[PDB]
Every structure is written in structure tokens, then in C-alpha cells.
């Protein structure tokens, strides 16, 4: 109704905009770097903390070649040397090494005590895992958990070892988490409870494992325990085509654990047992491939057994394992159809599934004049790269009963790498001559 | 009055108004983001700093079996091994580690030192520990403290060492913590100062010890003494009903300190001290049981004293431990009367305060055919759960007085922890064969 | 508009500017120190670890006399304790920490497998380091991979270790780059695939190594692979006119790698390969100088040979070093001509470049009624200062061939870095009485 | 209007400015602050400064047993070094003992003729406090027949001469990084402490000679930081001969009891102001003469000059020398190396007359002793410094001949504030059980 009063209207008006439009621009600037750097010491303060659980993402590397990873020569070096009495060894690694592992007998090679260490079972044998390609010594070796019968794996957080002690009939296991004691399992069947004596194997906290009671010539009670944290998160009796289960050899890869364990029934083909370890689910059967891998063992036969035992050799058997990828698969054994000498890495494609498949290629180990044991597997979970660089170890068994002209029996270690490139092999004995031990 | 200066007066009002309303909530957004910045800098800065001291907040863990815990297998690795002498060994725990504790003899087993290494004192002697399930050796074994009579315990930030060395009638006791020297005391009733000869416990700081000076067989001038960051808080005389006291094994429930010590003016009946420490005192009697745990001890009677001292066998005694904690308790004894041979641990409920009170439950640890020695109260205050894992040491003793083919004396380790299950037992000898040795 | 228009315009407009020129003041301002923060978080974070690629960024410090830096007297330990039987060793440095390296036989000198390790190549030789000046037990030394032949360098980051192993006719360098295996490589010319055994050298990440693999005594296949994190980057085939390459010892100044080699088929001067680590490229010859420092040799001439070998001794040698920077130019050789006996460092002026270069100053490391053996180069590059220290080790070996006395061969270390002032010269002998080993 | 806008415009500004003032001020003074705060406790994730010694003696009332190896004994049985010349170095986080190894065991054939000083294989080891130096347990700081090592509280310099007589050199060390070396300045035996050296504020001064055992030689202080050489000086005060001292600090003054090998019997004594780098010297006045051999105590002895008696020998030997809470440390016998002792003589050091006023066995005079040096935790927990000292224990050669070796072991002690009763410390060696 008058221009000097709608000026006035109109001074505020086009100031307002101004003033709400910078506003607008610091406030919103403000809270933009502020949202900023809160974000920044979040990260670079969860940076400055630590770690987590690790999942078996990647998938086994190609195997054309295996290459040599360590070894103890622990018999040459404790013929002057305190080294101690093992046996039934293997490899596992943490995030941030990897060192041996086997069951400390209680002496040193050359202590008078190591008279009688053929006994597999007594009150001074102990989980110990030491420096990869250093011996057993007395000084280097450190004690997981004492008995007869181990396990141990790391699961990305820090790691479990179980170990086994007690008379035949009256055994139990303790599961230790963290180097403390978390579990005691309790023998169910009264008959020598015992477990893989290779590593486990964990997906996301979750580390199964197989354990068997009962007869070692007959139908035992075995169990898939699942741990997390050394609690018992579920069992599960034993299901599938496997008719007999001892001393299992485990790895994973695309989240399922295969193991690949010693029939000592009947079996000569060795059976497997397939893992989900987040359902928690099992099944289990035998190798198919003809090419039998257990030892003793029939002669390869053409066409074998996916869901029964190959029979032929009962009573008997040595642990050993594979690596069953397809085609990428590879299978180990002795060379002896009769006693734990010699050792070779067939690839033998689809050996899980064809029961016709046979050798493509392979590679020797250890000459079948040389003396040898158990196997099984790991790899380095922690290693670099985009896949799984599956390896194995072999147990070379000096002493009686085979060389019983010492009174001992120890061993020494040999462990091996998948390669992808095609590698000229050599062969891996002991290296230690008996005879200087008289 | 005019409607120009008159409407400038309004124009400039109007705009200041929305223009300190904008200065006011800028104002307030940088001040509640500074604060906001404030406020997780600190928080996440917190986060990568500090450690306490431990509280004893914790019941005990229902107690129906003990599992293996640790073992050294050292009179048999020492066979052949630089292994240490020893005797007087125990367990002690740090928030990180569990290791073994020993009397050092200054020599190896195999030394020709080790010639009347029976003695007790001696200017070579001194606390060393070690990895725990290790063997004492030369080269692994970490010396504590210069002495022969030791007490050591982790105040949940640092641990505390206490060894005492001298002639009998002028014995010091000297206070290690952090690793460094920091109390001193001198004796005084100049007639050998002791101590736990096992791990002491703590309580907000405070680690109290039991002390003595006087005869093996009088009254004698034991003293509880209250540390704290190796620091005199207090001590007082021993009150309570106690003939005598020596060697006590003490532990730590929902904050509270119970130790069973060893009566040598009469007990077959221990003594047991009870401490508060944080009221800084104590309070002496006797397990009223007729299940009488110290050697060597008269059989058992149907109702023994509760109060008083039975005399039996008399003068002679042997370091040792229980767990009382009403029906939950759990006390042990050598299988034998005359000497140190054999170990047992039996369920007795409420035997500290019924005079008629039975056994319920046992586990053989040695059978009565191999030797055993001291043993010993000790838990890992650091694990997690809910309560407190009961675990005792015994100690094995090899050679001198039992074993007189040999030269010297020294000792293995043995320690089991409690369980939640009803465990099968198994025993535990040393191992060792003595006629190697000869 | 109007006269009220264009005077109220001129207040908006007035205002505006105003109003922006302290938006503009301000936006500027929050965004600066929200760049400030960020930027100082960003760096005062990363302060909290941190770890880059190693960069030859400074000459060699000027060498005017060496000084002692490590010494083990390993054999002198070794006639009494568990020391292993080793050859072919060297140092090499981590960032924070310089380590002995050397090729275990897999027993100790006093174990009976030391019969006959004169053998350059078996299944049980390892790579290993240990602690600087001290020996190689079996209790101190970390296999750091296995064969028969090797090398080993720390680009700052971590550290790549290479074994080759495998028989005359199918060896396989294995390289391993922070504690794991990366690749492997098969031989290519089938003949003892062989290569550094001293330190290599990284420059920003590219570590070259060169191998041969073909004839010893006549003209051979040699490589220069180039390695960045154990993943071969290049492999550059030997150019230039050196004829036979073995054993090369390697140094970096300024963003070059000087490497000099053996020629073991006619050469008794010393070839030289200078490569180009970023260029990933090389060049090689043989020092100029007349002071040929092969061995065995020939007595010295008045004139040397830039580009061929120096004829007169055949299919033999010895591993050896230089460091050739101008008039800053010193050499190590035996001073036998005919056998591993002695050592001696002369300045030579030029010895790379003028072939009629002399010495004008010297130093004697070894007296010749000493053995010596194969020497090498390195430095700490990671000293603070202005250049890098020159240094060198000369490995000592002791019994066969030229002690037939014991069944053995080994060695002990003695190693000097360089020194800016004219320091007193002592003779560093291995040390042991062979009769001992008697 | 044309004069009324101009103040619309004038005064809304004003109000524009009071308030960008205000925010730029605001802004300002909390981005600093959080500038401040985080760089602060940044600093608080981070680490060591130099050690200075900032306090006094604690007072000493007896000594308590601190660490013994008992390494003879066990290396009887066991592949321990043989060793000698032994002494004791805290770093801010462990106690370790350091020797000079002679490069073999004890039963090591290699040990026949040990008794010799300096050889080509010797080192300058340490390892963990009361465990003794073996194969697989001593570490390696240089090489060399002659050593002291030092931490100044960011980190540690060891220090050895080797070489000939006539051409010896020290290379020293800093961080386990040879940084410097000196050169024989008289081409006779270059040497230095055989004990721990001691630092402030990074500063860390150690005592050298160079020339005759038996005449006028050139000693000299040299001024360390980092290994480097900031100043070095030569001998001043009345001492006419240094060999071997054993040094200790408190309140920002280094003081070293050292040996004079040529005349005196009484030790003389070396006062460093680690901060001005400079020093004098005197002897010990005390009667109470400390030296080995020695001649018997007499009334009164001498402050500026040697105590005549016995020329040309002596042992490495320390003191505590801190006004009426000094206390001398000795040989019981005046012949041999033999027992050990403490004695507490009210300024020894001022007072040419003063006498025990009270004193403790370290080791009987029935038993073997050997060298003796200062040492001190300045890393410890309170408001005064523990003096604690190690004794050498010598077995083997010369007093020991059935044997051809001639090794060692340790005992040390640190001081109480208690009047603590005694015992003996002696190694514990059958000599008999090695034949
Ligand atoms: C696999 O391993 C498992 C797991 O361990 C094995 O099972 C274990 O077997 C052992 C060995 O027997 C058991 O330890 C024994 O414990 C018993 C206590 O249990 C009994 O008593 C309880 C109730 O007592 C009351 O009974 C009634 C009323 O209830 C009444 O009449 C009376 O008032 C009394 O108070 C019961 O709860 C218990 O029954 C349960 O447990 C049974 C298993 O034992 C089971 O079978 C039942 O079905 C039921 O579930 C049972 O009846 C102790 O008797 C015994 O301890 C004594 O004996 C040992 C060995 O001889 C000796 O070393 C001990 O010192 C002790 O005896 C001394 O002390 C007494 C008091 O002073 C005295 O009376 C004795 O004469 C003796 O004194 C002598 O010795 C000492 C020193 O040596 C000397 O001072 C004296 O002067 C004199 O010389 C055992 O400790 C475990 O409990 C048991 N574990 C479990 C969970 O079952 C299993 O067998 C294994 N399988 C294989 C294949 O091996
Ligand atoms: C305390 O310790 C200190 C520090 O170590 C000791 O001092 C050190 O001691 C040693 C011994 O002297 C010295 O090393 C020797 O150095 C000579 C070279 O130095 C001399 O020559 C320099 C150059 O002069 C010549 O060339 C130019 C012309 O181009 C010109 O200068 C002149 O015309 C002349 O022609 C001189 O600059 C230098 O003089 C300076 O130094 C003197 C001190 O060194 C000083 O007195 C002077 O005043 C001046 O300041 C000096 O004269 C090295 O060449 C010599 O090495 C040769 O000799 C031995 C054999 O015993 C052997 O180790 C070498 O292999 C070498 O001999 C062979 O090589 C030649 C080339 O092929 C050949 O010609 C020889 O005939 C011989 O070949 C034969 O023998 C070898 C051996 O195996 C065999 O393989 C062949 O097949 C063949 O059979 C020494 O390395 C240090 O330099 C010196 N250090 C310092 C800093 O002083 C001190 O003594 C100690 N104190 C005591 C008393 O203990
Ligand atoms: C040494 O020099 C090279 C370049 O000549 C550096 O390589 C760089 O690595 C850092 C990694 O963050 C980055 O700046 C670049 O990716 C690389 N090259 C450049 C500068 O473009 C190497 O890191 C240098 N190292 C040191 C410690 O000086
Ligand atoms: C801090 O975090 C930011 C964003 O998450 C990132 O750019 C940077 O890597 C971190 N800075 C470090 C690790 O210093
Ligand atoms: C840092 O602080 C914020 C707020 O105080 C908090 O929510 C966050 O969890 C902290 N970061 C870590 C990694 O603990
Ligand atoms: C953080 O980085 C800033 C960037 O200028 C610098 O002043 C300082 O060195 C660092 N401060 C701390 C305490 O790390
Ligand atoms: C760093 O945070 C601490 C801990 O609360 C605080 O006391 C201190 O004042 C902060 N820094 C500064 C120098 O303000």
C-alpha cells in the first residue's frame, strides 16, 4: 500500500534468501568434514586393534609338481645331540609362522630311557610342536598337552590343541583353548579313545574333528566334535559308507572340510568324510579310484569301491592323505604293498568320484628302500595370494620294529608344497645310518 | 518522528534477528561437534592403554575329576640331557603364561655336583622357572632370585618372587618385583627362615605369605606378611589354635585366601590358615577330618580331634594341599604312612569343619609302588568362565633318601587340574629307571 | 523500477558482497583445518608402524682400513658341544638386526655323520641364519629354507630367501619371500642348478639374483632372474664379455648393484656383473687390474685383461669379492696362489677400469699359514649416516681335503666392515687344533 | 535515503563482522585445541628419553644377594663359555651379565691355555641374570679382548679393543651398530673399564689407558653420545696411573674407583661432570688400601699420591664413595685374589685416617676371588639408587694349576637399608671332579 514500505519488504526478503542459502552451505560444509574425520580415527583407530576368525575362502591351488617346504633330519643330527624321542608328527601354521608338531616319546634318542619307545601309549609321551626344520630338541620344543594322541589348529584367533592320555580303558581328552584347558571329553566306549594326530582345519571359529572308540579290528563309535572357542558347540555320530575310522588327514577350501582318514578293518581303499563346518553337517564314503593308498593294500585292481571297503588286507593300515580337487587331485601312498616304505604323489583325476580312474602323473617322495610312515595334510592359510597352496608332510620311522638291531623307535620329518610349475623331482630318505647308533 | 530513520531502525532489526538466530546455530553445531570430536578421541585412546590388578571375585568350579594338566618326564629326560637339580617345585600363573618353579641345585643331574644334592641349603641353590611341561634345564630355565626357601605369585600386574639365603641362624628373605629387588628382611628368631615353597596369591595388590623362623619341632616364630608391589602393607605373629605351621599352599576364592600347611610338633591333622586380604588378617585351625593328609601319619580314626593336635606319628611331616570349599571339597595324601610314596586325592565333604566326615570320591594320582613328594595348591586366576579351576602340582622325588644306589636327589613335576566331569583316572609315575644312573 | 528501486538495489547488493566475502572467509577456514587435522591424524597414525622398500640411496663410506665386527670360533666350540657341520655361509641384515647365514650338513661336528661331508650336495643340507658372532647350534639356528645352494635379501619390507636343491640332473630353486614359499623354478640347463650363496640386494623392491646352471669346467648357461616379493618380474640371459660366471658377491651404491663373480673355467681374474635395478638390466666384464685375486692363479703381471679371463689356471676357483668405487677400490683374494690359504685386502685404485693399477695401501685378515676360503660381501643398510659400510666375511674351512685327519669338513666366520681412519691390523685364524678332533 | 541507506548497509555489517569474528574465533580456538589434545596423546602411544641421574645413593645399612651363575659348577656338565673379566649392565627392562668370552667351553679340549688375556677368540657375550654364559644362551655384543658397555636410556654401546699389542683398536658400538673406532694412541695395549660403563642425559664417559703396566701411561676420558666422540680428554688430578675402573653415577657425577698397576695400593679415583665433560682425579685416602696385592693397612694413608708397597700389580676393584655412606670393597687376603669383602669407612676418600665402622664377608678368605665392579639399576622403581656390585670369581690358573684352563663364575649383591645378616658366596667348583 506504499513502495517505502514494500521496499522494506522487499530489503529483508533478498537478504533472507542470502543469509539462509550461506547458512545452508557452512552448515551443512561443517558437519560433511566433521562426519569426515570421525570416520577417519574410526578406521585408523580400528587399524591400531587386531584380528578375526579366518574363512576358507579360496579354493586349493593347481598341483603340477610338488616342492620341498622343510625338514627335520632330526635322527642324523641326535645321534649327538639331545633330541627327543617322537613319533606321529605333522604340520599346522598359525597367522604368522609355521612350526612342526609330533608325540614327544619322553627321552632323547640317545638317553638310555629311549629303550622301548615303540610303545605307542604311556604316561611320558606330550603334544609338542617345535621350529619347522629344526628337531625335536629338549630346548626348542615346547609342550602343547600332555598324552598320546593329538590334535591342533589354529582358527585365525589363536589356537586348540587336544591331547589324549589315560589306560586303554579309561581315557579322556582335554581341549585346550588359548594354552589353557576349556574340555574334558570322557572315553564313551572304554577302548582307547583316540583322534587324527594331523591338524584341523577351521572355518569362522569352527574347528571339527574326528575322534574313534572302540575296536582298532572292528566296528568303533566315531564322533565329528565341534569346537569353537575349546567348547563343545555339537556332535554328531559317524554317518555314510565309511565302515571304519582312524587318524584322519583334514584341509578345506570353498568352506567344506574334507579329511581322509586309515581304514584298519577291512579297508585298503581309504575312506573320507566330507565337512560343512557351518551346519555342521557330515557324510562320508571311501575313495572310488582303484588305486589303492592305504598300506598294507591288494594290487591295484582295474575298477575299485566308492561305498565299501576294498578288501584284500584287514587289520592294518598307515594314515595318509589327499588332496581331492576334480581333476587337480592327487593321492599319496607308500610304493609297498606290504610295510611302510617308499612314497609317492599320484595325480590320479576325479579319484573321489571314478572307480576306474588311474595315474597321469606322479612324483616320489622317498625310494621304496627307504623307510617311512605316516602322512597328512595342512597348508598355510595365512600365505598370500588368491588360492590355497596345499602341502603335505611324510614321517620317515627309524627303529624298531623294521631296524630292531637299535632297541628305539623315533623318527624324522619331510613336508612338501603343491607347485604349478613342473619340477624336477628328488627323492627324501632319514639320512641317518643306523649302524653309527650301535 | 519520521518512517525513513524510523524504517532503518526496522530493516536492521529484522535481519539481525535471523542473523544472530543463524550465527547461534552455527555457534552451536562447531562446539557440539568439537565435543563430539572430544569425545571419541579419548574413548578410542583409552581403549589402547591400561591392565589391573586381580581380584579374587570367583568361586571355585564344582570339582567330580581332575584331568592331566602338566608334566616333565625331567628325571627322565635328564638322563641324557642338561638338566637342572631341583626339588621344592610348584606352578604359578601370569595373565599370560603358566610356567614351573623349582629349587635349583646349582648342577646337572648327570653332574658329578649333583653328589649330595639330598641337602636342603646351600649358597648354589635359587628359584628358576621354565615352560611350563619343560624339563628344568641350563639353557631354557629363568633364574627368579638367588635363594633356598621361595614364594612367588602374580599381583595381576607384575609378579612377586621372594627367596630367602643363609646360614641357619642368619637367613635374609629378599622381595623381587617387576624382576627388581625391593624388600629385605632379616630373620628373627635366627633359626631358618621359610616360606610356601609354592605360589603365594594376591588381591587387589595385597599378596599376603606365611613365614617362619624357629624350630621344626617347638613353637616357632611364625609371621604373615601383607605385600603389595613387593612393599611391607603389614605383618602380624600367627594367632589362632596351630601347634605349628610350615610350607602352606595356599589359594583364592570370592576374596578370601585358605592355606593348608604341614604340622610337625604333632600333625597328621594339617593346620589352616585363612586370610582376608583386605581386611589385611588371618585365622589358624585344623581340617577336623579323620582322614588324616600329611606323612608320615598314623591309619585313620573314626572321629579325629577338630581343634587340637592327635599325635599318631609324630615330628615329621611332607608339604602338601587341599580345597575346602563345603561338600565341594577335595583334600589329598601319599597312599602311605611310613614315607613319601604314593599320592591320592579323595572327595571329602565339609572335612575342615566335621570330625566324622568320610570319603565319597577318589582319584589315584601315583600308585603306591612309584614315589611321590610335596604337592601343592596354584590356579590360573586369569582364564575366563564363571569360577576358578582348582589344579595342584605334586612333586616326584627320585634318588636320596629312597634311592640310595644314587648319589644325589632331584625330582620331576606332576599337576592336574579339576573338571566338571566324572574323568577316568590314570596315575602318573616320574618314569625314570634308576639303575641307568649307575 | 524507479528512484526507491535503484536505492534499495543498492542495499541487497551492498550486502550481498559483504555477507559472501565472509562466507568465503569462513568456508575457507573450516575447510583448512579440517585439512590440517586429517592430514596430521593421517600421519601421526601411520607413525604408529610403518615399513618401506629399501632405496641404494648413498655411496660406499670411504675405505681407509677395515675393523673386526663378528667372529663364531665355531669348530673351536664344536670339540665339545652340539654346533652342526656348515659351509658356504655369509651375513646378511633385517632392518633392525644382522644375522650369520650358512648351509647346515644336517650333523654336528662331533656327531659320526659328519663322515664325509666334503660332499657338496645332499638331501640334508638347509640354509640358516643365527645370531651374529655366536655359533650354529642346533638350538639357536632357524632354517630358513632347504638346499644344497642358496641366498638370501631383505628389501627392507621383508626378506627373500632362495634353496635350491634336486639331483645333478633335476634341481629347483624354491624362493621364498616372508617366511612362505612364492615360486619355484626348474632347472634349464640341467647341470647343477646353482647360484648366489651370499647376501642379495634389493633396490625399491627389485631383488636380482643371478644363478648358473651348465658346466663347471667349460662355457655355461647363466641367468640374472630379477625377483620384487619372491615374484620373478624378468629374467635377463648373462651379456657382455665375462665367459663363465659362478659365485657372486653383490653390494649396492647408488641405485647400482655391483656383483663380482668367479670365473671357473679359464678366468683367474674375476668377473664383474654392475646391473641396473630398476632399468632391470646389466652389463659385465672382469676387473682391469694385474692383481688377480681368483685362486688358485696365476703370479701377478704388469698388465690384466678387461674383457677376457685371465688364461694360465683352469676349472677351478675361488668365491670372492670386491668393492670397486674409483680410487675407493679395494680388493679380497687369498695370498696362496695355489690353494685356500690366507686372506689380504689391498687398495687398488681403479682395479676395475686400468689394468695397470696397483696397490698404495693393504691389510692382512688371515696369515697364510691359516686357511681361509670362500669370501662375500655386505652391509647394514640401515645404519643412520651419510654412505654405506663396506663389509666382508671369509668363511675358514677346516679338514678335508687339507686336514684328512678327520673324516669332515666345516667352518667357522670372521667378518670387518671399513673405517674412515687407519686403524692396526690383527690376523683373524679360525682358531681350532684339528689334534683335538683326533 | 542517499545518506540513511549508507547506514543500513554501515550498521549491518558491524553486526555481520561481530559475527564472523566470533565463529572464525571459535572455530579457531577448538580446531587448536584438538590439534594440542591429539598430538599430546599421540605422543603418549610413543617412547624413551634419555636417562639422567637425577638421584642419590639409597643408604647402605648391608648388601643382599641380587644373581650368581654358579657356572663352573654347572659347566661341569654343560657347555658353558669359559670366561673371565666378568660384569653386570641394566638395561630399562632386565639385568644381564657380560663377561669376555674366550671362545670355547670349559671342557672343551679348546680351554687348555685359558689363562691367557687376549687372543684372537674373544668377544664381549651377555645373558640373563644368575644363568651362567653358555653356547645357546650368550648373545654377542664385538670382538675383543677388552670391553664396557652402557645403556643411556634410549639404548645400549658396547665397546671392544682387539688387536695386537703394539696396534690394538676399540670399535664402539651404538645400537648394535659399530659407529666409531679408535686407533693404539701408544701402540702398547690399548684398554678400557671391564665394567659397565654410565651415562646422563645420553652423555656416557668411559676410561681408557694406553701404554706401560708399569711406568707413566696415557690414559684417557673420552665423551660418548649415540657412539660418537664429542670431546675426549686426557688424565688430570693426582692419579698417576688409571687401570680398570668401576664407575657409578648419582646426582648428575660420574664416579670410577679404578687400579693403579704401577705404584699404588691404594685405588685411585676418577670424578667426571658428565654435563661440562670434565674430570680430576685423586686416591682414595683411607688407610684402609683396597688394592691386591697390598700392603698390610697401615695409620694413615695417602689422597694425591700411590701408597707405596707393592709395584706393578693389581685387580679391578670398586667403591662406594658418598660422605659417611662410603664403603670399600677389598680382597681379604694382602697376598692373593682371595675371599671378598665389605667394609664401611666413613669418608675413605677425605679422611686419611678413617677405619671400618662396620663391614660384611662377600667370600670367605678361604675361597677365590677376582674382580669387582660397580653397578646400578637407574632404571629402578623410588627416590634413590640401589648400589650393587659383582664379584669375579677365578678357578682354574695360576692358584689353580691341576687343571689348564682358568675360568670363572659370578656372585653379586646390592645394597639394603636392613642390617641383613651374612652369609659366603663362593663358586662352588670341586676343582677335583674336572681331573
Ligand atoms: C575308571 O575310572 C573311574 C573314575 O575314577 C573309576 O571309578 C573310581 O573308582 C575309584 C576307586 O575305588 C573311586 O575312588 C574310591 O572312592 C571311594 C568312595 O566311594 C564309595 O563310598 C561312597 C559313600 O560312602 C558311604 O557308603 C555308605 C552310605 O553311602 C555307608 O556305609 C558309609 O557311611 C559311607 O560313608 C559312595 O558314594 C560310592 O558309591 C558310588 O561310587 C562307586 C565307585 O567307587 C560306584 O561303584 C557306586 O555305584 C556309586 O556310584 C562308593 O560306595 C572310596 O571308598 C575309595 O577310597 C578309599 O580306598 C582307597 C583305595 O583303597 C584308599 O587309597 C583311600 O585312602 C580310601 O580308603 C582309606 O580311607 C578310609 C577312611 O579313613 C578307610 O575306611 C579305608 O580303609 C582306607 O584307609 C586305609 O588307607 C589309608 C591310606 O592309604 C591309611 O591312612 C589307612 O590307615 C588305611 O590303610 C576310593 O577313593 C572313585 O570314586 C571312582 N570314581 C567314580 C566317579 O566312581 C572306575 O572304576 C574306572 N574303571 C576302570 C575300568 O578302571
Ligand atoms: C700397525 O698396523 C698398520 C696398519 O695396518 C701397519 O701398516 C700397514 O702395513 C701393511 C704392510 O706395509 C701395508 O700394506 C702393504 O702395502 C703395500 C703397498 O703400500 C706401499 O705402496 C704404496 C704405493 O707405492 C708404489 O706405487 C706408486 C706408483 O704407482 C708409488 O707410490 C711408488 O713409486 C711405489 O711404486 C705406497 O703409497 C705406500 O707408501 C706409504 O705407506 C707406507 C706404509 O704402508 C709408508 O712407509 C710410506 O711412508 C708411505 O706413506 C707403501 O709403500 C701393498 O702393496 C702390500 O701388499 C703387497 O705385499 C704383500 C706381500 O708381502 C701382499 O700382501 C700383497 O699381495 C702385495 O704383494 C703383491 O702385489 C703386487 C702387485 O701384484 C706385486 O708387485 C708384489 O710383488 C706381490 O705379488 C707377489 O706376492 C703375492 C702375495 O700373495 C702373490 O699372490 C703374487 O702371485 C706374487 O708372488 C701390503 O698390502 C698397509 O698399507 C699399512 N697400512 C697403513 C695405513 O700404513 C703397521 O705396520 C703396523 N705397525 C707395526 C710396526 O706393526
Ligand atoms: C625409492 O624410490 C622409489 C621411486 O623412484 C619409490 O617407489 C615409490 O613407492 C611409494 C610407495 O608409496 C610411492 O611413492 C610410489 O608408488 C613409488 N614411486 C614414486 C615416487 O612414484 C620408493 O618407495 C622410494 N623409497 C624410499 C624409502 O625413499
Ligand atoms: C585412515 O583411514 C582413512 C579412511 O578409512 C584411510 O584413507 C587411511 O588408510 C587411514 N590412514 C592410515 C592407515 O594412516
Ligand atoms: C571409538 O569411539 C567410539 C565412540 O566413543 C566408539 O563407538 C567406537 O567403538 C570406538 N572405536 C573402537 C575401535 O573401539
Ligand atoms: C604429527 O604430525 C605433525 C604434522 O605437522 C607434526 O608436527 C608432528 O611431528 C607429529 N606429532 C607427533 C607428536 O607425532
Ligand atoms: C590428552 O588426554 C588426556 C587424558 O584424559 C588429558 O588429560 C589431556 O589433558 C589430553 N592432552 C592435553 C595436553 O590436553
Given at each position: 500500500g506504499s513502495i517505502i514500505n514494500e521496499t522494506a519488504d522487499d530489503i529483508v526478503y533478498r537478504l533472507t534468501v542470502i543469509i539462509d542459502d550461506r547458512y545452508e552451505s557452512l552448515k551443512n560444509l561443517i558437519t560433511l568434514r566433521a562426519d569426515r574425520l570421525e570416520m577417519i580415527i574410526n578406521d585408523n583407530v580400528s587399524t591400531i586393534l587386531a584380528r578375526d576368525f579366518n574363512n576358507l575362502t579360496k579354493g586349493l591351488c593347481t598341483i603340477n609338481s610338488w616342492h620341498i617346504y622343510g625338514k627335520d633330519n632330526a635322527v642324523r643330527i641326535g645321534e649327538d645331540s639331545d633330541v627327543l624321542v617322537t613319533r606321529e608328527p605333522y604340520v599346522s601354521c598359525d597367522p604368522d609362522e609355521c612350526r612342526f608338531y609330533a608325540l614327544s616319546q619322553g627321552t632323547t634318542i640317545r638317553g638310555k630311557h629311549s629303550n622301548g619307545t615303540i610303545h605307542d601309549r604311556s604316561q611320558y609321551r606330550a603334544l609338542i610342536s617345535w621350529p619347522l626344520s629344526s628337531p625335536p630338541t629338549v630346548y626348542n620344543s615346547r609342550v602343547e598337552c600332555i598324552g598320546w594322541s593329538s590334535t591342533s589348529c589354529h582358527d585365525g584367533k589363536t589356537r586348540m590343541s587336544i591331547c589324549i592320555s589315560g589306560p586303554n580303558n579309561n581315557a579322556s581328552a582335554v581341549i585346550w583353548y588359548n594354552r589353557r584347558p576349556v574340555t574334558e571329553i570322557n572315553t564313551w566306549?572304554?577302548?582307547?579313545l583316540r583322534t587324527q594326530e594331523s591338524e584341523c582345519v577351521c572355518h569362522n571359529g569352527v574347528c571339527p574333528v574326528v575322534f574313534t572308540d572302540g575296536s582298532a579290528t572292528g566296528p568303533a563309535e566315531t564322533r565329528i566334535y565341534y569346537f569353537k572357542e575349546g567348547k563343545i558347540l555339537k556332535w554328531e555320530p559317524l554317518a555314510g559308507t565309511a565302515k571304519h575310522i582312524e587318524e584322519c588327514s583334514c584341509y578345506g577350501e570353498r568352506a567344506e572340510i574334507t579329511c581322509t582318514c586309515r581304514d584298519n578293518w577291512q579297508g585298503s581303499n581309504r575312506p573320507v568324510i566330507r565337512i560343512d563346518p557351518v551346519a555342521m553337517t557330515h557324510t562320508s564314503q571311501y575313495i572310488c579310484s582303484p588305486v589303492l593308498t592305504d598300506n598294507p593294500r591288494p594290487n591295484d585292481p582295474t575298477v575299485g569301491k566308492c561305498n565299501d571297503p576294498y578288501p584284500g588286507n584287514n587289520n592294518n593300515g598307515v594314515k595318509g592323505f589327499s588332496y581331492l580337487d576334480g581333476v587337480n587331485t592327487w593321492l599319496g601312498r607308500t610304493i609297498?604293498?606290504?610295510?611302510r616304505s617308499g612314497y609317492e604323489m599320484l595325480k590320479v583325476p576325479n579319484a573321489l568320484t571314478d572307480d576306474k580312474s588311474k595315474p597321469t602323473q606322479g612324483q616320489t617322495i622317498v625310494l621304496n628302500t627307504d623307510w617311512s610312515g605316516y602322512s597328512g595334510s595342512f597348508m598355510d592359510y595365512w600365505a598370500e595370494g588368491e588360492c590355497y597352496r596345499a602341502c603335505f608332510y611324510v614321517e620317515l620311522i627309524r627303529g624298531r620294529?623294521?631296524?630292531?638291531?637299535?632297541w628305539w623307535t623315533s623318527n624324522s620329518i619331510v613336508s612338501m608344497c603343491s607347485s604349478t610349475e613342473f619340477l624336477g623331482q628328488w627323492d627324501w630318505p632319514d639320512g641317518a645310518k643306523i649302524e653309527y647308533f650301535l
Amino acid at each position: 500500500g506504499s513502495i517505502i514500505n514494500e521496499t522494506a519488504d522487499d530489503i529483508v526478503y533478498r537478504l533472507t534468501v542470502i543469509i539462509d542459502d550461506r547458512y545452508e552451505s557452512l552448515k551443512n560444509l561443517i558437519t560433511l568434514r566433521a562426519d569426515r574425520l570421525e570416520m577417519i580415527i574410526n578406521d585408523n583407530v580400528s587399524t591400531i586393534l587386531a584380528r578375526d576368525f579366518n574363512n576358507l575362502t579360496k579354493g586349493l591351488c593347481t598341483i603340477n609338481s610338488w616342492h620341498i617346504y622343510g625338514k627335520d633330519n632330526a635322527v642324523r643330527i641326535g645321534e649327538d645331540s639331545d633330541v627327543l624321542v617322537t613319533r606321529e608328527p605333522y604340520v599346522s601354521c598359525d597367522p604368522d609362522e609355521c612350526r612342526f608338531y609330533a608325540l614327544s616319546q619322553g627321552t632323547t634318542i640317545r638317553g638310555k630311557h629311549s629303550n622301548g619307545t615303540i610303545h605307542d601309549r604311556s604316561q611320558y609321551r606330550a603334544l609338542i610342536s617345535w621350529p619347522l626344520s629344526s628337531p625335536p630338541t629338549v630346548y626348542n620344543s615346547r609342550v602343547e598337552c600332555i598324552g598320546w594322541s593329538s590334535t591342533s589348529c589354529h582358527d585365525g584367533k589363536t589356537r586348540m590343541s587336544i591331547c589324549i592320555s589315560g589306560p586303554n580303558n579309561n581315557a579322556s581328552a582335554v581341549i585346550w583353548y588359548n594354552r589353557r584347558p576349556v574340555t574334558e571329553i570322557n572315553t564313551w566306549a572304554r577302548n582307547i579313545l583316540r583322534t587324527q594326530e594331523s591338524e584341523c582345519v577351521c572355518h569362522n571359529g569352527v574347528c571339527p574333528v574326528v575322534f574313534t572308540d572302540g575296536s582298532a579290528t572292528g566296528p568303533a563309535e566315531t564322533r565329528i566334535y565341534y569346537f569353537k572357542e575349546g567348547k563343545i558347540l555339537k556332535w554328531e555320530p559317524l554317518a555314510g559308507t565309511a565302515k571304519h575310522i582312524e587318524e584322519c588327514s583334514c584341509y578345506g577350501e570353498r568352506a567344506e572340510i574334507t579329511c581322509t582318514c586309515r581304514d584298519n578293518w577291512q579297508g585298503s581303499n581309504r575312506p573320507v568324510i566330507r565337512i560343512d563346518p557351518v551346519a555342521m553337517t557330515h557324510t562320508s564314503q571311501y575313495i572310488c579310484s582303484p588305486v589303492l593308498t592305504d598300506n598294507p593294500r591288494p594290487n591295484d585292481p582295474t575298477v575299485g569301491k566308492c561305498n565299501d571297503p576294498y578288501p584284500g588286507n584287514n587289520n592294518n593300515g598307515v594314515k595318509g592323505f589327499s588332496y581331492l580337487d576334480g581333476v587337480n587331485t592327487w593321492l599319496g601312498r607308500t610304493i609297498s604293498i606290504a610295510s611302510r616304505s617308499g612314497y609317492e604323489m599320484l595325480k590320479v583325476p576325479n579319484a573321489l568320484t571314478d572307480d576306474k580312474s588311474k595315474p597321469t602323473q606322479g612324483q616320489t617322495i622317498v625310494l621304496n628302500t627307504d623307510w617311512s610312515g605316516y602322512s597328512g595334510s595342512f597348508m598355510d592359510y595365512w600365505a598370500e595370494g588368491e588360492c590355497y597352496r596345499a602341502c603335505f608332510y611324510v614321517e620317515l620311522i627309524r627303529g624298531r620294529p623294521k631296524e630292531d638291531k637299535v632297541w628305539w623307535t623315533s623318527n624324522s620329518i619331510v613336508s612338501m608344497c603343491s607347485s604349478t610349475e613342473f619340477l624336477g623331482q628328488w627323492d627324501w630318505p632319514d639320512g641317518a645310518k643306523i649302524e653309527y647308533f650301535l
